[PDB]
Design an enzyme around this catalytic site. Structure first.
Site, PDB file in Angstrom:
ATOM      1  CE1 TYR A  54      32.380  19.792  66.800  1.00 54.90           C
ATOM      2  CE2 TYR A  54      33.542  20.854  68.635  1.00 54.90           C
ATOM      3  CZ  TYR A  54      32.721  20.939  67.299  1.00 54.90           C
ATOM      4  OH  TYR A  54      32.463  21.846  66.768  1.00 54.90           O
ATOM      5  CD  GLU A  56      32.029  17.775  63.113  1.00 55.10           C
ATOM      6  OE1 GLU A  56      33.009  18.419  63.929  1.00 55.10           O
ATOM      7  OE2 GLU A  56      32.198  17.925  62.189  1.00 55.10           O
ATOM      8  CG  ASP A 208       6.047  19.637  61.383  1.00 54.28           C
ATOM      9  OD1 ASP A 208       5.923  18.553  63.196  1.00 54.28           O
ATOM     10  OD2 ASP A 208       7.100  20.495  60.977  1.00 54.28           O
ATOM     11  CB  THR A 234       9.422  20.076  68.507  1.00 56.53           C
ATOM     12  OG1 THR A 234       8.443  20.205  68.511  1.00 56.53           O
ATOM     13  CG2 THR A 234       9.881  20.165  67.000  1.00 56.53           C
ATOM     14  CE  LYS A 237       6.058  23.360  68.618  1.00 60.03           C
ATOM     15  NZ  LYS A 237       7.600  23.045  68.405  1.00 60.03           N
ATOM     16  NE  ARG A 243      13.339  26.026  72.869  1.00 60.65           N
ATOM     17  CZ  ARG A 243      11.495  26.253  72.810  1.00 60.65           C
ATOM     18  NH1 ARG A 243      11.378  25.615  74.027  1.00 60.65           N
ATOM     19  NH2 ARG A 243      11.098  26.492  72.156  1.00 60.65           N
TER      20      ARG A 243
HETATM   21  C1  8AU Z   1      34.976  16.413  61.654  1.00 59.86           C
HETATM   22  C2  8AU Z   1      35.357  16.943  61.030  1.00 59.86           C
HETATM   23  N1  8AU Z   1      34.439  18.881  60.769  1.00 59.86           N
HETATM   24  N2  8AU Z   1      34.932  19.552  60.174  1.00 59.86           N
HETATM   25  C3  8AU Z   1      36.565  19.165  60.004  1.00 59.86           C
HETATM   26  C4  8AU Z   1      36.549  18.431  59.966  1.00 59.86           C
HETATM   27  C5  8AU Z   1      38.008  17.481  59.988  1.00 59.86           C
HETATM   28  C6  8AU Z   1      37.766  16.470  59.124  1.00 59.86           C
HETATM   29  C7  8AU Z   1      37.019  15.984  58.439  1.00 59.86           C
HETATM   30  C8  8AU Z   1      36.673  15.281  57.042  1.00 59.86           C
HETATM   31  C9  8AU Z   1      35.369  14.683  56.180  1.00 59.86           C
HETATM   32  C10 8AU Z   1      35.538  14.708  55.162  1.00 59.86           C
HETATM   33  C11 8AU Z   1      34.298  14.181  54.130  1.00 59.86           C
HETATM   34  C12 8AU Z   1      33.115  14.561  54.527  1.00 59.86           C
HETATM   35  C13 8AU Z   1      33.316  15.045  56.180  1.00 59.86           C
HETATM   36  C14 8AU Z   1      33.968  14.784  57.060  1.00 59.86           C
HETATM   37 CL1  8AU Z   1      33.750  15.087  58.821  1.00 59.86          CL
HETATM   38  C15 8AU Z   1      37.226  13.993  57.431  1.00 59.86           C
HETATM   39  C16 8AU Z   1      38.423  14.288  58.126  1.00 59.86           C
HETATM   40  C17 8AU Z   1      39.346  12.909  58.091  1.00 59.86           C
HETATM   41  F1  8AU Z   1      39.047  11.796  58.908  1.00 59.86           F
HETATM   42  F2  8AU Z   1      40.248  12.716  56.553  1.00 59.86           F
HETATM   43  F3  8AU Z   1      41.236  13.631  58.450  1.00 59.86           F
HETATM   44  C18 8AU Z   1      38.938  15.183  59.216  1.00 59.86           C
HETATM   45  C19 8AU Z   1      39.001  17.165  61.073  1.00 59.86           C
HETATM   46  C20 8AU Z   1      38.796  18.657  62.410  1.00 59.86           C
HETATM   47  C21 8AU Z   1      38.139  16.525  61.834  1.00 59.86           C
HETATM   48  C22 8AU Z   1      38.828  18.772  58.816  1.00 59.86           C
HETATM   49  C23 8AU Z   1      39.758  18.095  58.855  1.00 59.86           C
HETATM   50  N3  8AU Z   1      41.083  17.732  58.465  1.00 59.86           N
HETATM   51  C24 8AU Z   1      38.646  20.011  58.637  1.00 59.86           C
HETATM   52  N4  8AU Z   1      39.153  21.223  58.142  1.00 59.86           N
HETATM   53  O1  8AU Z   1      37.614  20.220  59.273  1.00 59.86           O
HETATM   54  C1  PLG Z   2      36.221  27.311  62.053  1.00 66.14           C
HETATM   55  C2  PLG Z   2      34.943  26.258  62.249  1.00 66.14           C
HETATM   56  N1  PLG Z   2      33.459  26.333  62.091  1.00 66.14           N
HETATM   57  C3  PLG Z   2      32.412  26.281  62.671  1.00 66.14           C
HETATM   58  C4  PLG Z   2      32.473  24.856  62.829  1.00 66.14           C
HETATM   59  C5  PLG Z   2      31.033  24.391  63.569  1.00 66.14           C
HETATM   60  O1  PLG Z   2      30.417  24.555  64.739  1.00 66.14           O
HETATM   61  P1  PLG Z   2      29.534  23.513  65.704  1.00 66.14           P
HETATM   62  O2  PLG Z   2      30.493  21.870  65.721  1.00 66.14           O
HETATM   63  O3  PLG Z   2      29.007  24.034  66.071  1.00 66.14           O
HETATM   64  O4  PLG Z   2      28.339  23.050  63.961  1.00 66.14           O
HETATM   65  C6  PLG Z   2      33.325  24.692  63.197  1.00 66.14           C
HETATM   66  C7  PLG Z   2      33.236  22.645  63.903  1.00 66.14           C
HETATM   67  N2  PLG Z   2      34.668  22.333  64.293  1.00 66.14           N
HETATM   68  C8  PLG Z   2      35.229  20.933  64.107  1.00 66.14           C
HETATM   69  C9  PLG Z   2      36.828  21.018  64.959  1.00 66.14           C
HETATM   70  O5  PLG Z   2      38.081  21.712  65.271  1.00 66.14           O
HETATM   71  O6  PLG Z   2      36.944  19.766  66.194  1.00 66.14           O
HETATM   72  C10 PLG Z   2      35.244  24.943  62.658  1.00 66.14           C
HETATM   73  O7  PLG Z   2      36.253  24.410  63.105  1.00 66.14           O
HETATM   74  C1  PLG Z   3       4.670  21.804  63.392  1.00 66.02           C
HETATM   75  C2  PLG Z   3       5.999  23.132  64.091  1.00 66.02           C
HETATM   76  N1  PLG Z   3       6.970  22.746  63.430  1.00 66.02           N
HETATM   77  C3  PLG Z   3       8.375  22.733  63.755  1.00 66.02           C
HETATM   78  C4  PLG Z   3       8.317  24.144  64.281  1.00 66.02           C
HETATM   79  C5  PLG Z   3       9.523  24.960  64.700  1.00 66.02           C
HETATM   80  O1  PLG Z   3      10.182  23.697  65.917  1.00 66.02           O
HETATM   81  P1  PLG Z   3      11.526  25.195  66.867  1.00 66.02           P
HETATM   82  O2  PLG Z   3      11.007  26.623  67.072  1.00 66.02           O
HETATM   83  O3  PLG Z   3      12.374  24.750  67.670  1.00 66.02           O
HETATM   84  O4  PLG Z   3      12.711  25.229  65.365  1.00 66.02           O
HETATM   85  C6  PLG Z   3       7.414  24.627  64.840  1.00 66.02           C
HETATM   86  C7  PLG Z   3       7.122  25.708  65.962  1.00 66.02           C
HETATM   87  N2  PLG Z   3       6.060  25.801  66.964  1.00 66.02           N
HETATM   88  C8  PLG Z   3       6.376  27.395  66.953  1.00 66.02           C
HETATM   89  C9  PLG Z   3       4.505  27.285  67.944  1.00 66.02           C
HETATM   90  O5  PLG Z   3       3.525  26.436  67.963  1.00 66.02           O
HETATM   91  O6  PLG Z   3       4.430  28.095  68.955  1.00 66.02           O
HETATM   92  C10 PLG Z   3       5.618  23.939  64.369  1.00 66.02           C
HETATM   93  O7  PLG Z   3       4.664  24.527  65.611  1.00 66.02           O
END
Ligand code: 8AU
Ligand code: PLG
Ligand code: PLG
Ligand code: 8AU
Ligand code: CL
Lengths: 442, 442
Positions: A54, A56, A208, A234, A237, A243
């Site tokens: 992770y 972020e 694009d 992208t 292609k 991807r």
């Molecule tokens: C990074 C992340 N993603 N989703 C998240 C978090 C966390 C988090 C987010 C953020 C933040 C705040 C403002 C804007 C953007 C971001 Cl990423 C800050 C902190 C801190 F460092 F302050 F503790 C922590 C965590 C899991 C790391 C989080 C918390 N607590 C929650 N509840 O959810």
């Molecule tokens: C409840 C929840 N939902 C959605 C996401 C988003 O997942 P992607 O990062 O795959 O977009 C997180 C990420 N969680 C950050 C952490 O708990 O460390 C999450 O904690």
């Molecule tokens: C110009 C252009 N921009 C963005 C995308 C989106 O890419 P993702 O599929 O990775 O989201 C495509 C998809 N092209 C589909 C095709 O030409 O067959 C595209 O042709």
């Protein structure tokens, strides 16, 4: 406390379908303009344990620690990206986190315009992407037509971008962004003329270049980085990467764009980046900046010219009567068969291509063309002399499709009943498999 | 026409960072609550040539053909998903295309409420996700606070979801969706009580179970599928899959939701799905439905309880004084050190954890806690007895962190200067590496 048995042992059911999938790829003439074949090194990156992490945020500004090796990988990717596209990092920035092309475009557009913001893009039916603002009378099909207020420009009756109509529309509509670079446009783009129109109304210029990225990188086609505020692409292609996607932004023309775009990608839209992707993108971008890859890209265009010429030699019509790039759109109106019928016919013979609209088509129901392209087959080693065989296989599929339409009728459900068992298709399939099967396969 | 030399040969530079990163993972006590480690078979899927294929649309309703083997993989994944979460395919549907947790949430939310729609979620400072409507006085930080109109509910002084505040807010705000399921919440959720609140106001119930998915699938914790309209989850945390996401929808309770969600994922937001991801998700989902994986998930909870208890035995305070799940939030106020300091100290000893807000913190600036979790170390074979050693290492880090703050001051720039070459850290790091290095590594 885990099962480390190999894929074949752990899940034989899944491993058979994947081995089947691979056989079908190896024995297909793949003319999907948007497809390619990744090498082993790119696929080693995508399966690398780096995706366990992770990370972020951005390098040296991460929410978590333990990210020194991830930081080097993300910085290596950004630098190799800028190197590849002939841009100075003092003038251009790149974000390497978007998970795919559509995500990248929505994020970039949001950065520039915000919710309710005004965008202009090419109609889908004329070769624009869905994320260039596509809607239909029925519905706002893309989020880009819904979270934004969009207006769509058409190409002319000959399949060319109509700049006069773009100008007319921009002055009445007053958009904050104008999108160019397309999904199935067989010609190069006049970015200079677009930049002049954007200046006239004060809009940003969004290029694009997903389909033509390698042509821009290798200085074979026009360079949008001379004129554009934002370039998206992208990596999967013609570039032949994983991807993923890239958003480029012009710092010099727009001070403070760097923060708008980076904050748009995270934390506005995404969470954790996928570091296996970024790693893989690094790996391919190193191949992109070699002269060996300029050779490959040059061949893509040579095969595409050769294919266009061979199709015309067999009295098959092409939209704009030719190509400046990797792709061709075939106009099937003189045969009175739709695009979907020929796609069905080509599926039956292991030829991969897609149905595609043409200028005369008003409705996306019954598109009158197919789109084809050479990147994949060029990757598999096909040369100019090999395009005659492909053109021949395509001429033969059109003729068979026309025979079947007479026998079983113009309705699609009836038409397909004609396909299985057809001796000529079985014969033609056989010729395809034997030829395609032989080619080098990454 | 490609370079098929292995990664070490083609890019020695990238391969050394990757081999280093792999070493850092093997030699770290990884307490990141959202992290895990994928087995070899899931990583064979992620590097599989199936990612060469463009398969926009849904199985048996694809835009292209050539997708027979892709369709079998996508249907197998949806089926194995419904089975894993103990839901009938007649009553529940699942979309398997979302590229990540955040994408999935935005898509699902849009499907349910559209642009300008009203949503309610837990504040980020109180343990909600960014995609649950997060904003700040400075800006609308998430798109979910911008494309939607959001209101955020807090937890109480003891770190519990305050239902009476949720109810009061729901009745005055009248949202179309109420989001529950969180990122750093150490207790189980009263979904039944949420369903009662949504019904009262006619809102949808959205359960994000990304952090607890394995507990829901294995019936160890409450089942949101009994009361929720939509359930989203990542596949990469406790579930131990690739980086991807799932959206579940209750067809029985909402006729016509199936179309709203499938269309929101594509073509509203995404383009091509990533079939390596889906293959990988299928592979792991087979493992999830074994009783062996139920054993693993039970152990996650056992290790988490044991860890909570050993930390309290050493006079360290926990938010809500314990856990019902895989994660703990340590309240560091009694030592007068911030969470970011202890994160830096733990980084210096190869202990991966993150800083995290606690109820007392008005601001997200200077959070007073850290979050820890057991899925990763449980995957590495750690048992209940091993939690005393982790608790020992964490107490030692807090004490060192307190010493360094005395010596160099409370300012973070001043503090960090004391970390490189500290004898006790070098010593503690050494003990971590030796213990961690020895453990099973998938
Ligand atoms: C990074 C992340 N993603 N989703 C998240 C978090 C966390 C988090 C987010 C953020 C933040 C705040 C403002 C804007 C953007 C971001 Cl990423 C800050 C902190 C801190 F460092 F302050 F503790 C922590 C965590 C899991 C790391 C989080 C918390 N607590 C929650 N509840 O959810
Ligand atoms: C409840 C929840 N939902 C959605 C996401 C988003 O997942 P992607 O990062 O795959 O977009 C997180 C990420 N969680 C950050 C952490 O708990 O460390 C999450 O904690
Ligand atoms: C110009 C252009 N921009 C963005 C995308 C989106 O890419 P993702 O599929 O990775 O989201 C495509 C998809 N092209 C589909 C095709 O030409 O067959 C595209 O042709
Ligand atoms: C699939 C896809 N994605 N982006 C795309 C396309 C195309 C396309 C899109 C669509 C469609 C229409 C409405 C809603 C959703 C979709 Cl995916 C239809 C067709 C057709 F079958 F009619 F030929 C084709 C193509 C490359 C396959 C396309 C075209 N032409 C363009 N310019 O851009
Ligand atoms: Cl991936």
């Amino acid at each position: 406390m885990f099962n480390n048995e190999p894929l074949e042992q752990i899940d034989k059911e899944l491993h058979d379908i994947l081995a089947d999938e691979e056989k079908r790829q190896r024995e297909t003439i793949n003319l999907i303009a948007s497809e390619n074949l990744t090498n082993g090194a790119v696929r080693e990156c995508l399966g690398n344990r780096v995706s366990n992490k992770y990370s972020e945020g951005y390098p040296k500004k991460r929410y978590y620690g333990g990210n020194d090796f991830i930081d080097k990988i993300e910085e290596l990717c950004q630098k190799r990206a800028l190197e590849a596209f002939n841009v100075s990092d003092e003038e251009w920035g790149v974000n390497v986190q978007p998970l795919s092309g559509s995500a990248a475009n929505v994020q970039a557009l949001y950065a520039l315009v915000g919710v309710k913001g005004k965008i202009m893009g090419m109609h889908l039916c004329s070769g624009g992407h869905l994320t260039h603002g596509f809607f239909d009378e029925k519905k706002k099909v893309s989020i880009t037509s819904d979270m934004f207020e969009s207006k769509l420009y058409k190409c002319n009756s000959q399949g060319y971008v109509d700049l006069d109509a773009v100008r007319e529309m921009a002055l009445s509509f007053k958009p904050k962004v104008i999108i160019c670079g397309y999904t199935s446009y067989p010609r190069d783009i006049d970015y200079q003329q677009f930049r002049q129109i954007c200046d006239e109304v004060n809009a940003y210029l969004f290029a694009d270049i997903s389909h033509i990225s390698s042509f821009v990188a290798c200085n074979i086609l026009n360079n949008p980085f001379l004129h554009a505020d934002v370039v998206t692409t992208t990596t999967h292609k013609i570039l032949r990467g994983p991807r993923s996607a890239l958003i480029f932004f012009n710092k010099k023309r727009n001070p403070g764009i760097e923060q708008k775009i980076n904050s748009a990608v995270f934390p506005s839209f995404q969470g954790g980046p996928h570091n296996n992707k970024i790693a893989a993108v690094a790996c391919q971008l190193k191949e992109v900046h070699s002269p060996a890859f300029k050779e490959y890209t040059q061949q893509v265009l040579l095969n595409s010219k050769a294919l266009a010429k061979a199709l015309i030699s067999k009295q098959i019509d092409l939209v704009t009567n030719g190509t400046d790039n990797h792709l061709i759109v075939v106009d099937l109106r003189k045969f009175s068969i739709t695009g979907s019928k020929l796609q069905e016919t080509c599926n039956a013979i292991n030829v991969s291509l897609n149905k595609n609209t043409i200028p005369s088509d008003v409705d996306c129901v019954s598109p009158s063309g197919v789109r084809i392209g050479t990147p994949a087959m060029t990757t598999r080693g096909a040369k100019e002399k090999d395009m005659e065989f492909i053109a021949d296989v395509l001429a033969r599929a059109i003729k068979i499709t026309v025979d079947l339409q007479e026998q079983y009728g113009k309705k699609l459900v009836d038409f397909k009943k004609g396909l299985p068992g057809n001796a000529q298709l079985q014969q033609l399939k056989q010729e395809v498999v034997t030829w395609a099967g032989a080619l080098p396969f990454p």
